[PDB]
């Protein structure tokens, strides 16, 4: 089997991407944030504290003839950005782009933090990291991909995120028309539960490539590119007037600037992030200070190849017995 679904930016900045997901019988379609940095499929629901729902579409398990309470199971998750959610668990039928999993754990939120409530466009998350990170207790549950894997034509999924435009998540096949050149594959460590890999270096604009190992994660659920302070300083030094602002929470730059590209290495291959992908717009409405899309990972404890990086590539998440990651230009 295979599946193919379009993923759409939630706003004009590509802050996140939503993908429609069918849950239950008859189908209830919710727009979920596919997150290769976590491993829980959770949804706003009829159980979510009413004051914490503001415009989201909810899953109502009592209206699904295939929903079953997973007795005694609870979940609770906190994300890198400080947001959180928790609740109980159902199993139900879940389909993405024509690919169906029966008995998928659907984690129903009883509580969500303010950032989730305030974002009316995201109805929940669909985790695509390794199932070892799943938070369901006392019986850990599998991700949608883990459950689908054996049925797929090939044990892979691909992320093809757009810049200010829709893109695609495919399951079970590699669309050879969706990228240019070849796909370069690179080793993955699953030790921390992430799609963790080592970039071979970077360049800023038309500058020379610096060969240096940068361990980080491929994370579709993180907006920006978070890299070591040395790398980030080298980038922003090429933008007149750019500075790190403790009050704003990162590097800012004059909105009048033209940003240089940023290149990262994948083995001997190179992925080029155009400068415009690094512009996250005014820090507040009407400001002439703009927020940067490359930020320091210092104090996160891990480098993160988030959407800024991933949307410059066609990315293969290869879930074979020994997982790997592939990157191609597009």
CATH topology of the largest domain: Cathepsin D, subunit A, domain 1
Q: What is the spatial order of strands in the main beta sheet?
A: 18-17-12-13-22-14-21
DSSP helix fraction: under 10%
CATH class categorisation of the largest domain: Mainly Beta
Shape: globular
Q: What is the radius of gyration?
A: 20 Å
- Intertermini distance: 25 Å
Please, what is the CATH homologous superfamily of the largest domain?
A: Acid Proteases
Structural class call reads mainly beta
Largest sheet: 7 strands, mixed
CATH architecture of the largest domain: Beta Barrel
Annotation field: number of helices: 4
Active site: 35, 199
Enzyme class: hydrolase
Organism: Cryphonectria parasitica (Chestnut blight fungus)
Disulfide bonds: 255-290
